[PDB]
Amino acid sequence: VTSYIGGEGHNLQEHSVILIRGGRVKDLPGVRYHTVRGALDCSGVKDRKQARSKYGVKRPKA
Amino acid sequence: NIKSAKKRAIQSEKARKHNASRRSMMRTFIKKVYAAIEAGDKAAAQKAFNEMQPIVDRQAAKGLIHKNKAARHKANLTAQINKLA
Amino acid sequence: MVTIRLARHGAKKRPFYQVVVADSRNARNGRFIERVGFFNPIASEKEEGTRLDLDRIAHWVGQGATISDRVAALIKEVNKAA
Amino acid sequence: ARYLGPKLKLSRREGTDLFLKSGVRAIDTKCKIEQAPGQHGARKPRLSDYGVQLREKQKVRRIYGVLERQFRNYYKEAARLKGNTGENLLALLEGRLDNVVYRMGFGATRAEARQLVSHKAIMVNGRVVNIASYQVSPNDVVSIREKAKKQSRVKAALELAEQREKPTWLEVDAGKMEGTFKRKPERSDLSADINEHLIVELYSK
Amino acid sequence: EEAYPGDILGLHNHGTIQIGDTFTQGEMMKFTGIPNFAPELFRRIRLKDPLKQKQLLKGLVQLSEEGAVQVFRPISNNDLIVGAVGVLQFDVVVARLKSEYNVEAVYESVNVATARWVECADAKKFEEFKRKNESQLALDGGDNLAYIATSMVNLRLAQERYPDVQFHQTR
RNA sequence: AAUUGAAGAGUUUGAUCAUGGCUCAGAUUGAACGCUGGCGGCAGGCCUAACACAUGCAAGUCGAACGGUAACAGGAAGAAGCUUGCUUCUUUGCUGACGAGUGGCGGACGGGUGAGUAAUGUCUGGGAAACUGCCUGAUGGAGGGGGAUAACUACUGGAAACGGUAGCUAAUACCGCAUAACGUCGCAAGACCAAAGAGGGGGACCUUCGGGCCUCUUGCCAUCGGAUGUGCCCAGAUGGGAUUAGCUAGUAGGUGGGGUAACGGCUCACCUAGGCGACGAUCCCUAGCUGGUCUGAGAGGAUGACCAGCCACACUGGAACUGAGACACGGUCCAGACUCCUACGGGAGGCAGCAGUGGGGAAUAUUGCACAAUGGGCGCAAGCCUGAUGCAGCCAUGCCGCGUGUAUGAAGAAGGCCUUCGGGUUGUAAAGUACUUUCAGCGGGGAGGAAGGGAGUAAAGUUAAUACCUUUGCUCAUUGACGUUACCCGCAGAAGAAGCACCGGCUAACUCCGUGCCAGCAGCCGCGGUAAUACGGAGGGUGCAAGCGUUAAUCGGAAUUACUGGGCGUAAAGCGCACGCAGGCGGUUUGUUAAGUCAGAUGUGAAAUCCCCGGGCUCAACCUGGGAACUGCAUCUGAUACUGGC
The missing domain is CATH 3.10.290.10 (RNA-binding S4 domain)
Structure with a gap:
């Protein structure tokens, strides 16, 4: 199944591995799923400081 | 199987054998009377019956042919032996 | 073999027993015939902590029921007629 | 579980004295009370039925120091207890x-x-x-x-x-x-800008 | 059986045993022997088998309470570093498809000279350390601790943040 | 006193009302993932592969059953370590005891799992054709002999596992005989059936002075019971599917042998030709059932992890044996798949017991302690066994508590942010000043779970008896895993401890900049093509807090399967029309019946949970006393308008 990659930029490539989350996006029909960022082979969005839980970024050294 | 109760198994084997013998003899002792009934000789029947009755009740008290199983055997014998004879 | 024994219902570190008639072959907290009285190993000292229906107990005993050591160690501990 | 933050900040948003600063001198001020709860606090927040229905209970909390997970339980208790659930809730508080x-x-x-x-x-x-x-x-x-x-x-x-x-x-x-504690305080001998019907109303659906 | 001096006995390590762990019947004392030196480096096993993921990791956090190598897992979940007896990083690959892990795994080059060196002492100060230079900071199989630096100068400045503790290798 | 509690909002249109779906706010979880993470109480923890398992343990116990000595222990006729008085030796099983064996009992409990099972199951209520170890009530019995056999010994094949031939020996092992009724058979006559001894002792007398004998204690036999547990039977109910409409030869019934503990086609023979089914059989799919659990105002919907009852399985399939009870998880036999040891000729095994490993998966724990308590098996008892149980470990997984400071503090700093530059804001927030130290860290003191058991004393207890045994007081020494326990008191010092989501609308909460239909957000509607409260960052704010978010899933809202509670002229929807079997419904009056209906009673509806009022852990969660409730079923006696039968 096809799945959506949130945020700006991702490390994903040919094989890798991800964790598919779910929930759809109605822009691109047929995509009923999301890939959880920062899970498994997925790297979290670089530099993301806000709502980092989603998009999977750790505290940038408060 | 590496538990000391396998001696319980060999024990029960012995038991088994013994019982098989006793029971066997008992049943043959009844078959005498049955043969006596099919052959139809009333005297011979009565004889056979009197021969088995103690051997039955005995095994009853010994706990193989238990209890009223004995009763059955004798009863349904008697109801037969003098029915046509 | 009917037995009047103790079942441990209470809580961690704070047990609350229950004296009960049951088949000996059963589990501690398992099937039983009826509940007779109870026992509290804590209770502090205030108003309470043990109750038994003695007239029932003796009925069962007389119906040929055995009693657990702790159980009788209750039964005579509460005395009898006083 | 304790608040741990500016108290006057809450006082100005709730728009009444929450008795947080009580201490030596009371009756607030010296905070610029009510006129700047936020950076935008000079605003004239016309608010929803929901909004006030919140602000009520949300004040009743801050005026005590109880948090939501507890407060809810409190309410439940009050509801279970016969009699006006508002005044019961206040009783509990x-x-x-x-x-x-x-x-x-x-x-x-x-x-x-x-x-x-x-x-x-x-x-x-x-x-x-x-x-x-x-x-x-x-x-x-x-x-x-x-x-x-x-x-x-x-x-x-x-x-x-x-x-x-x-x-x-x-x-x-x-x-x-x-x-x-001689007796549980009656509804009559305590009162404020606090409304019970607003807070009991909030937990319904 | 039961043993006498000079024999060699085996136990059952569950993060309780290390290297040079002295066992007595009571006398609190520790044998001054046992070498235990520090690793060089390189690596980044990034795995074929496109994951899992434990079996690789589990494999690595099980060849590591052994004395040869030891892994290094930074605070980015992925990016697995291993370090590094001498240069025989091959038994790793081989025990990555023997022992009890059906992984495969390969290598790369990694911007790490040190090694590192694994720190801890008094509180608060450490929490300011485990924050400022955290970029940059790692955690090991065994649940602690370590840094991971780019060179020698960037190693000195790190310690120079100071004054909280070694050096520490401990295998 | 003990069920008295019901919210709506967004989106079809230029707009409107109605229809109708989608979506949102709630509650819930054995959850997972992301970011984060300081305590403690209690609980929870393979939901996936009933997939495969290295290693330890999970069932043994009685010498007051028997032959007995292989060990430690006391003492011995004699020598002695010899320190002539204590100790040391050859043997010695005489005593305590006890390896191996025989026998008795337990291994059918306890623990695991949900595979199979749409009814040999379960739940509810009745019933007739049975059995029941250990514990019990009652009445009597226990007389006298016999033949074997492990162990052991002599050979002997074995790598091991295991044995194989011959001979000897005991018993509460096994077998006759005697004795037999309140028992079985038989209408009666009369026939026929049993058993076991072992201990602690002790006045007579004592005989062949083994001990006979007296006695209490324990155990055996027979019959009738009590209690318990287990069979068996009937009805009602307990998923979906008609794109499954017919199923069935021992099938349905009878008669008669046989059989079982017991009815029975359970089996066999013969004889009738039935039996089931749309009130859904049959066949497929799925599934353990219940008490209950989550949701719901309720009616319901969903669900049956943890806890308790019932069932079933214990490598796959099959079968018996032993025994009260098994067709038996840690028994046996056979077959099947696999695996392991082998000196190659041959053997051995099954974690869905505890813990653990691999595998699978988004994901689910320590190869811990102790039998001190509770409870179970053996024993007269002490006692022995006991991953049952009691505890401990790990994890924010959940619920419930608590802390991460408390006061004071300025035209209100710096900095960050907006600014029409006059200022506003972050903001009493910080600093500073006073102050308190729970919880953690260190150090001291110290409850409760402990009750019994082990040695001595007294009881018109019984006795021939002060011994023995039991009993009840008494005296002494002693009995714990948790355990550096809970809890108490000091020491130090704000000292060690805040994060996550959100701010266009539903929806509490705002601006700057950047970007520019790019990058990107979105649960729905919907944002972004040059001032974005919607993207990304920043300031600020709002909401929760050791958690916050996201996903997943159940109920709710959804009167959106509408019994309570909906619809069909045009929105989805009246068969194209008619006849008509089954089924549903039926004018009116009397008599009768009294099933439905209704009233009263009596059983029953396990405990736990829910609810009510109390009680105990500092409160809570948790624990617990009592009561209601279990809205149901059945039987009996009444009422009779309506309903049904006559």
């Missing part, structure tokens, strides 16, 4: 140990009242009580620790404590630093 403390004026604010109760500076009928949530029955008697009695804090607290509205349902002392 007023039955809190920390509350009974600030009320008996053993501490400046309810915030200060907590420090003691948690620091084992008080007791019930003579067993010491650590928990701030303790529900105070009638006839129960709260007393400052014999060990630490009359300190640089509680002494100055009793001062304006005597100078407050003062309660009815409880009987206080000075040198004994102990008091009795």
